[PDB]
Amino acid sequence: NLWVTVYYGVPVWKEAKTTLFCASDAKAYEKEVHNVWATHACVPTDPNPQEMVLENVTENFNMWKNDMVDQMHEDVISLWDQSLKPCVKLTPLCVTLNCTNTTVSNGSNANFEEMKNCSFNATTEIKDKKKNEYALFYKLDIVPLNNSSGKYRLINCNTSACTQICPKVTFEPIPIHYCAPAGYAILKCNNKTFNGTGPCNNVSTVQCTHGIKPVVSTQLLLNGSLAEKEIIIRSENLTNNAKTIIVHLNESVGIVCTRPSNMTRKSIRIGPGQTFYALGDIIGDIRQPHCNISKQNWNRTLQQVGRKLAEHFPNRNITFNHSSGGDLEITTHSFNCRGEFFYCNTSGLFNGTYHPNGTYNETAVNSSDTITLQCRIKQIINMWQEVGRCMYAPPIAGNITCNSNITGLLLTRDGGINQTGEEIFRPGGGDMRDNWRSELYKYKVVEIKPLGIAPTKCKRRVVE
Amino acid sequence: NLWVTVYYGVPVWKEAKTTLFCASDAKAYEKEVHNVWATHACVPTDPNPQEMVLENVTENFNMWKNDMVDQMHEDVISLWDQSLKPCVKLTPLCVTLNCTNTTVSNGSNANFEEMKNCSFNATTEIKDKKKNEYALFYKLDIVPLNNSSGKYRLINCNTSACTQICPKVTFEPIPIHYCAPAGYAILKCNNKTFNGTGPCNNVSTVQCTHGIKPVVSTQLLLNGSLAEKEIIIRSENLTNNAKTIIVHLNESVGIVCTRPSNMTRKSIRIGPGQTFYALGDIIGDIRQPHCNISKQNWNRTLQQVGRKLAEHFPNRNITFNHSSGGDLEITTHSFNCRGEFFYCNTSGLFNGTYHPNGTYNETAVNSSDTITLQCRIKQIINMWQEVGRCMYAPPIAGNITCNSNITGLLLTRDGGINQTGEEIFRPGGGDMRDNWRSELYKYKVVEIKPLGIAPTKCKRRVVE
């Protein structure tokens, strides 16, 4: 004889999806709406959060079908669109531009063909009157302006109405924490050699996630979280070439570079009540941007990556090659620095091959040497690969500089069916969501069901 | 000795007004934001919903003071405005037009004076440059600017700045459910001969409504629900001639037609990032859009509704007359057909008269005879019976053919005081809620009161 009893607060969970909310430390109470990511509205989490390790528990994880990443991507669209609406637009700027060679003062004849001194007719504070003006624009942002033209025009005039980024607000990657409401738990795997899919033997619960920073990149993941034990290779289908491969390093490579020039920040007025900013003049010598990476640091890193792919690709020769080419958005390493959008031609980084047998000791490589990466500046940017976005980056007075690590690489494989033996790995930003896939690979949202039923030997008493 | 007891969950309801949310069916999850009604956010109801047939209960219904249709109006204005915010505006189109007769190739002289070839100044993508462009505009959309001049202008230019329907979205009448929240129920009547006001002997409770499709019209109801027993004549005050009369037909009258012209869509650019689509040219001859109504199927419907009107108006001669006239919006049967707005005069439909005494056999009228209806196209549409915002209809790029069914008629009575004998009923779209009140007439939102008190012999037990 047994009876049914009810237990409340039981530790059982079921997989589902839910909406989350941001959370970050209130480091700066000042700088009103200066942060694009809106960290002011984020509630601080805890001076010492509660992290607790579960035992004797196995749970499966798969971030290739995770709603955690998909919610993050939908947010960044909304966060950017919210902060760009109260800004001036560049519609009156779309006029004929008279561009000529950039004049340099007394004090390189094959390298100065990047900036053009463009003159145009701009409306003054009164609509009827017009006064001529001058501005500097990059070669990548101008087109020959069709037939019967000895003059130039902006690239995105015939595509969509193109907006501008306000200078009062900044979009540095401040880390944020995505957190779940009451009754919702977020699980965290802890096995150091856990790839994309598989059960986790060290699952630990948490209130919510740790510091996650949104960094926009295409080929190399910057200033991210390092791996714990060794480099791990993550991919949904290794045998499928059309799917990208994420490489997560446990060692960081230092990449630093500048945009060496002082640019005068010139204020120009177009239309009644709208002002945009552009490059004023040149003081000194025009020098192209260039990013350096240490030879020994990069050469050593590619060796462990090559031999890590050797286990997943046995009896195969592994080599690294530059991008296929075509559109500039994905063939180069596009990253952020102070608010100026860069486009670095990454060709000398993947300038080697790996063999299963050989000698690759560090004493052979000469130290203090570095690889110079040519980069080009594009101040008019279309993001998310859609035809309806602008983010015009205003120039910043003085030369800019940045310091960041190298954490993750986005690789693609050719996989020729007739090709045998050697195989070629190329970098490519196939999907924008892949950047956040390297920080949400160990996280999963789950519901809590505090109701449990089981037979027992106790019976409910009835009053008589 | 009797004492009060408290009962919970009793079936007691009280009339109240509340908000309702959308609901739909998972017919197709494809396409990109194509649906104007936004059924993506509408929660699916149930593959087999729960309905309970109540009995022993009589409920009074009054749909003429119902908040269901009034709230359902408030959505339609919000859905239409929401889907037109990210769309281009036709402000630059307010330019002088050099219009003349259309040209037809080798291969009707009193039928082609409907569409006028027009040319105008057109700014290109660089704004400060104009090139001549041409398009075909309808007669109804142009005003000849000044007397004794061959130059025209758009009719809607001086009223209000107004935008264009984006081709990326569509607004076909998908059926939608509005479903009450928890704690509120919707009462459904089931008496076949139940007119607008009266008790209902077969009141049944449902979770929430069935499929209601939003269709806009002015004179005839299209693809609506069919009656069960017979034809019901409904009015708020039959003796008042200023209130419209809604007639519901249990027999479906099929109307099938098309606009017979294959016209290429031409993309015209009017500014930076702004483009609109207009008629390019005419291939073949020019023929007016016509619609067909079967003769035998029409007066057999009109004779049955003629008999039913005799009961409410005893021994009076019943005749149907064409619309009084005035503006085009309410004089003609305005409906939609694959995004094109039609305007057909119904002079060939409401022509005959009804005699209560006589013979009305079907064999007297010859079969295979259809009534032709002249229909005119107008792509500058203002609706809600007010001069507000446009909804510009783009070309079809082909030859659209759409098949529909006539559900009911919106009739009005002259109500002559000095006139005696004959009764004249004329169609009229005085208000457009009546297009939708024929679907929510058997529905009423009610609030549930689960508290009940009554004396009883039981007594509370007090500790001693």
């Epitope: 009157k129 037939n147 019967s148 033209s149 | 400060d128 104009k130």
Partner: antibody
Framework: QVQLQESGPGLVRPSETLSLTCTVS?????????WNWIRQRPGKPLEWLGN????????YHNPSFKSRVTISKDTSKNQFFLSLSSVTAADTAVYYC??????????????????????????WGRGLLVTVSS | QPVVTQSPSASASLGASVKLTCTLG???????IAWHQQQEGKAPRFLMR???????SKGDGIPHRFSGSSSGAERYLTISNLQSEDEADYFC?????????FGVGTKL
């Protein structure tokens, strides 16, 4: 269609200057936009001297040459002239007056000030035998 | 002022089909051209207008045996069914916004 007939002092014994005329048949000079002038000397390739507009009177004289060419508008009686000062003995040439094609593309220097893009030479017609000798 | 060059003369046999060309040279080669024909005295004639994509614009009384094509900085003109009266001087000119440069032409 339009027809162009030219008349004037083709035979000039005293070489001081030269004045020419082109009557226009059909479309008025005021309407239908641009009109042109073309020189042709016996042995060397033809050259362009200047330009005249129909509506706005925007004269695009040849930038290579200095102020040596003048164009009259004469919109009253459907006419346009040509006068060149200080004719040289090497200026012995045949003149052709031209109407241009309709490519309606209008640019803009100042507010409410438009002008049409130049177009290919379309009609052309006959000629006058000129022998400037002294 | 784009400058166009051309071969001084062309050699062909009677009754065959001539392939007349003139080369375009400038900093920007995007400027369009328009062919002409110069007979012996009287008045030369305008034939057709060329644009990007081979937009044929034969205006006044031009048969369908005057096709043309473009290949980089040089454009090809194809003439079929030659006659005795078809020999003349053909000029290719540019437009810009002034300084009509004209062409040297080729005499057969």
């Amino acid at each position: 269609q339009v027809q162009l007939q030219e008349s004037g002092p083709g035979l000039v014994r005293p070489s001081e200057t030269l004045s020419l005329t082109c009557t226009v048949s059909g479309g008025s000079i005021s309407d239908r936009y641009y009109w042109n002038w073309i020189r042709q000397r016996p042995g060397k390739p033809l050259e362009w001297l200047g330009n005249i507009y129909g509506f706005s009177e925007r004269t695009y004289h040849n930038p290579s040459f200095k102020s040596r060419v003048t164009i009259s508008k004469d919109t009253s009686k459907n006419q346009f002239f040509l006068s060149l000062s200080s004719v040289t003995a090497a200026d012995t040439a045949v003149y052709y007056c031209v109407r241009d094609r309709l490519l309606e593309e209008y640019y803009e220097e100042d507010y409410d000030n438009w002008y049409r893009v130049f177009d290919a030479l379309e009609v052309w017609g006959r000629g006058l035998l000129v022998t400037v000798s002294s | 002022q784009p400058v166009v060059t051309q071969s001084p003369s062309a050699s062909a046999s009677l009754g065959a089909s001539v392939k007349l060309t003139c080369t375009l040279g400038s900093g920007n080669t995007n400027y369009a051209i328009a062919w002409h024909q110069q007979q012996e005295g009287k008045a030369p004639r305008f034939l057709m207008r060329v644009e990007s994509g081979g937009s044929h614009s034969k205006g006044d009384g031009i048969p369908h045996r005057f096709s043309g094509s473009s290949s980089g900085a040089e454009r090809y003109l194809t003439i079929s069914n030659l006659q005795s009266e078809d020999e003349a001087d053909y000029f290719c000119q540019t437009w810009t916004t002034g300084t009509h440069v004209f062409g040297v032409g080729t005499k057969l």
